[PDB]
């Protein structure tokens, strides 16, 4: 493990790799109480133990807390100059898209007030949509909140298009489908899981609550932590409960009648699962409060693998695109740790 | 010298255990709530050779809920267990509070004409006074250097007790009494402010909402004593404080601005503490001024004539 300190007065809230855009996949953003900081990951000589070190590049000041953070495919590099596009959520309950050239915010769009969410925003994600001619036609941001609303915010050539959709319960996560921006997934706090075609009722709703194996009772309150697609065509869906209970469904052949596989993490997962970018069957989950991280294999290859235990709480974490490195933001730092097995 | 010290050390430890055992035996024999049949049995096993600290704790001190002696036992045993220690502190505070309330009730019955329960010997200290007497007696016996005085955990608990039991101005007590107690006991000023900062940032109940007004008052009182100490130490040497203390007072002013605003829009009518908070703002600004002057150079020029 190598450890890289965040500035002394910087409290991290969120950590994400720029896996969404290959030109910028070595860019790391930390949303904190005064903005979003960008770091670069480089192969040093090091020892080929952790043959990867972190270089802090710069800090984008915003003046208020950043709670969720997503890079877009529009990110680019030039010589040098970084052209960034970031979706995030701020203390004023607004959802924003910030477009920068390095630390300087050259452009900013803000969706808030009554036109925005009418309660706390719980999650956000972003994807670039191109026309048939293949110019940038739209950038699309999806967000979910405690106002029982899902918001699709499309920024198009002739300007913004806003749409709201009602939910049976607070939205706790949302993510567009890989290799198919026409589809996306929305998570409700109550265990409902929506598959949605925004170009169009919405196509499908699964639910983890009634499926709990109950060989070991998952408890009275098993609030849904997370749902994410897996695979590079978005061939699968993985859902994780706060309790640690997880379930996986695949989407291809024949007729289907239950979720394909199911299990339970050793610990609660407040932050939910972070699926491996290269190995579908694998995902990571943290015991954020004691600072341990379990690695789970869906086809039970795993047998309780806990590669990571810190002596401190974990605020957030995410896989580097290479699949062997992990970046983890803790309350005062970010660690890059390399698991030798995944190399 | 090595052979002397090793014997003086063995005699010091055994004497510490023996005094605990003597305090136990005396208290158990005198306890009204102990049956006579058991007392004779206690006197047989404790009025002889010195017993291990395990036995004294399990078979006697824990069975009779003598939590003060439990804490002395955790000290003599170098007992590394913060959670049990704090559980014992919580039991000792609550036990003492209930005993003080009981004695004040018996008193009020005498001053009103009633009759006490049979076999009850007839202005006893308020509960927070008897509680802090218990903390002092332990502190002098263990010297504050013990692991039974983790100020980071014990000061918030005592402050919690004061709030959740109204040991404040309503009954005529000094609202800062928890801070006075630990300062006089000799807790260093920097450590107090350091803890109080953590109380204010994390907002753990009951230190929440508008009761953080009281947390700010404790910080004001602690920093004030710290300033007076630095000024005194400067005059002393004629014949540490960082910017974090200044930042802490700025945040404290923001908390007061937030509490006053919330107080002005409460359902049922505005809050009554408007001027009380305005006063605290002035005190906090005055302290930030003093601290800013010390930090800014006046601390390196304390031994110089003005």
């Amino acid at each position: 493990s190598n450890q890289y300190q965040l500035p002394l007065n910087v409290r991290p809230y969120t950590t994400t790799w720029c896996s969404q855009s290959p030109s910028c996949s070595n860019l790391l953003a930390i949303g904190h109480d005064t903005g979003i900081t960008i770091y670069c990951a480089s192969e040093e000589q090091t020892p080929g133990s952790t043959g990867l070190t972190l270089q802090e590049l710069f800090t984008i000041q915003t003046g208020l807390p950043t709670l969720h953070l997503s890079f877009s495919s529009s990110c680019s590099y030039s010589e040098p100059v970084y052209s960034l596009f970031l979706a995030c959520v701020c203390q004023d309950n607004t959802v924003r898209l910030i477009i920068t050239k390095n630390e300087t915010i050259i452009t900013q769009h803000v969706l808030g007030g009554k036109s925005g969410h009418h309660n706390f925003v719980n999650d956000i994600d972003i994807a670039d949509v191109y026309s048939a001619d293949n110019r940038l036609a739209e950038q699309v941001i999806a967000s979910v909140g405690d106002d029982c609303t899902l918001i699709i915010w499309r920024l198009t050539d002739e300007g913004p298009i806003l749409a709201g959709y009602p939910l049976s319960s607070p939205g706790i996560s949302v993510q567009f489908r890989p290799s198919n921006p026409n589809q996306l997934i929305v998570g409700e706090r109550n265990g409902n899981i929506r598959i949605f075609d925004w170009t169009l009722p919405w196509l499908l709703t699964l639910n983890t609550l009634p499926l709990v194996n109950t060989c070991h009772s998952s408890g009275i309150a098993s609030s849904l932590a997370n749902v994410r697609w897996i695979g590079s065509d978005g061939s699968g869906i993985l859902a994780m409960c706060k309790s640690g209970a997880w379930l996986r469904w695949n989407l291809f052949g024949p007729k289907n009648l239950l979720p394909n596989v199911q299990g339970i993490s050793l610990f609660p997962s407040l932050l939910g699962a972070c699926p491996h970018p290269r190995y579908m069957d694998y995902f990571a989950t943290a015991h954020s409060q004691h600072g341990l991280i379990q690695l789970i294999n869906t086809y039970e290859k795993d047998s309780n693998s806990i590669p990571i235990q810190l002596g401190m709480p974990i605020v957030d974490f995410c896989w580097h695109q290479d699949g062997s490195h992990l970046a983890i933001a803790t309350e005062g730092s970010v660690l890059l740790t390399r698991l030798m097995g995944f190399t | 010298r090595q052979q002397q010290q090793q014997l003086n050390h063995e005699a010091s430890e055994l004497l510490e255990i023996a005094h605990i055992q003597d305090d136990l035996l005396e208290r158990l024999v005198a306890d009204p709530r102990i049956p006579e049949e058991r007392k004779a049995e206690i006197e047989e096993f404790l009025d002889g050779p010195i017993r291990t600290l395990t036995d004294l704790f399990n078979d006697y001190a824990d069975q009779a809920n003598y939590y003060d002696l439990c804490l002395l036992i955790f000290h003599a045993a170098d007992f590394h267990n913060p959670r049990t220690i704090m559980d014992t502190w919580n039991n000792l505070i609550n036990q003492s509070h209930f005993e003080a309330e009981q004695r004040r009730e018996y008193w009020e019955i005498v001053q009103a004409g009633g009759d006490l329960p049979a076999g009850v010997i007839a202005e006893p200290p308020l509960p927070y006074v008897y509680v802090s007497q218990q903390i002092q007696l332990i502190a002098h016996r263990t010297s504050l250097d013990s692991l039974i005085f983790p100020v980071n955990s014990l000061l918030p608990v005592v402050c919690a007790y004061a709030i959740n039991n109204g040991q404040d101005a309503s009954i005529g007590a000094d609202p800062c009494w928890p801070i006075q107690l630990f300062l006089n006991l000799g807790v260093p000023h920097a450590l107090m402010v350091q803890v109080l900062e953590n109380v204010l940032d994390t907002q753990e109940a009951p230190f929440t909402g508008r009761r953080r007004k009281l947390v700010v008052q404790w910080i004001a009182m602690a920093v004030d004593m710290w300033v007076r100490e630095v000024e005194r130490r400067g005059a002393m040497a004629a014949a540490v404080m960082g910017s974090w203390v200044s930042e802490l007072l700025g945040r404290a002013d923001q908390v007061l601005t937030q509490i006053a605003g919330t107080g002005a829009t409460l359902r049922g009518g505005a809050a009554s503490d408007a001027e009380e908070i305005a006063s605290l703002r002035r005190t906090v600004k005055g302290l930030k001024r003093s601290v800013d002057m010390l930090l800014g150079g006046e601390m390196a020029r304390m031994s110089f004539f003005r």
Binding site: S168, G191 | R210, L256, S279, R281, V291, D292, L294
Partner: protein
Amino acid sequence: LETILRDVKTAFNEASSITLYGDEIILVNCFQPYNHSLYKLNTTVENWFYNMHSETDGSELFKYLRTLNGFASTLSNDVLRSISKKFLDIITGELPDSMTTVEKFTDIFKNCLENQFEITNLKILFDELNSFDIPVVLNDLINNQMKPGIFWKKDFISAIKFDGFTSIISLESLHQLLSIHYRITLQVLLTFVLFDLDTEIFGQHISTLLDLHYKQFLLLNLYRQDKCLLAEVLLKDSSEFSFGVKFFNYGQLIAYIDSLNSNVYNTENSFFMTFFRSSHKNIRFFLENVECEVQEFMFAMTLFSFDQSYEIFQLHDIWKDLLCTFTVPHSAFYYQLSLLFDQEFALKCISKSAEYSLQDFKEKQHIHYLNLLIHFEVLDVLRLGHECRTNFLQLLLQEDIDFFSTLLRLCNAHSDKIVDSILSQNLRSCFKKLYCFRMLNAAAEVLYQYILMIRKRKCYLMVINVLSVTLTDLRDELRG
């Protein structure tokens, strides 16, 4: 725990005997003291609920409900929850009021239902659905079965004393009824999002259903959040029946439960939010939900008990403090918030209010700001401000006295009456001489001379440099 709780409950509930409560009420007494089971005559809807996989015959409404359940039972819990959430979102505005019904239903479908059910069961449902005269069946369900009656008081024997038994039996019965209602309502709404049912024709029903579902959810939530409190607010709702009720037959009981149902579907929300405030987590769903000027302030105080709170409050315009603030009605609100969190929120609000405002109030605000800043410039600002209560300032500067000295030096550098005098007095109250000199920049010279009346050389020297008679005297003294 799950298992032991279930077993302990089961044990406790072992049956022992029958008691005919009242005239005709079937009561069973259990092995464990304080544990009884009442057996309650089902209403029509309850009979439908409890006999889906049975009723050979049944009315049209029953068959309709059975087919709806036939489809909805194939969906999973997570899906159903996400759908329920979305239906809440329509009321809360998280699904904007700007959208058409068709658009919200499309949102719901894509996000929740697409790919989440077997198309075969959809076909089964559509077919079965085509046999029914939907407007009529829905009419009978909404306006007869589910929406209860207007009462001209139909003798719910008023209890003179609190009756804990009838209290818990009533609350549990209400909970069963509303749970059943909830499941039905959700299944129907579901059918409204899946099929092209004229959003105008059924506009009334849809909005009634979304209104009813919502209320159902709320109640059920409160039920599992704090039963005692729910009972308390639900019985202090009815005035003449504040203490409770007595029922001696099944008709009186059913009628009372229905009565409470009416209360729920129709002054309640306010009484209950009030009693509550005087269940933290639920009221978030239900301040995002149940709130959608008054609702704004509620959202504020609830979200405070911090960014969201402050923002909402500012945009718009413990209990005792709140009452005081209401009586005053910005300054008061911020002061109260600051006091209550006394932290970041507090300090921020206080600072903002103080700024927006700029003898008692002024002094308090100033002191607070200064303290907060010294804990986290401010000094000089406040000073110049007040200058443009002198003893107060003397005390503030008393607290100030290294950081203070640095600030003073900064102010003097920037410059290069009352304030000056106060400062001189405080300084006069090595270090001392230096501070005095720095501030006065004659006073310096006087102080140095007085102190003098290595050290000698340094003083004489400093004096000579500052002056550049006195010099000659100093030189002569140093030479002597």
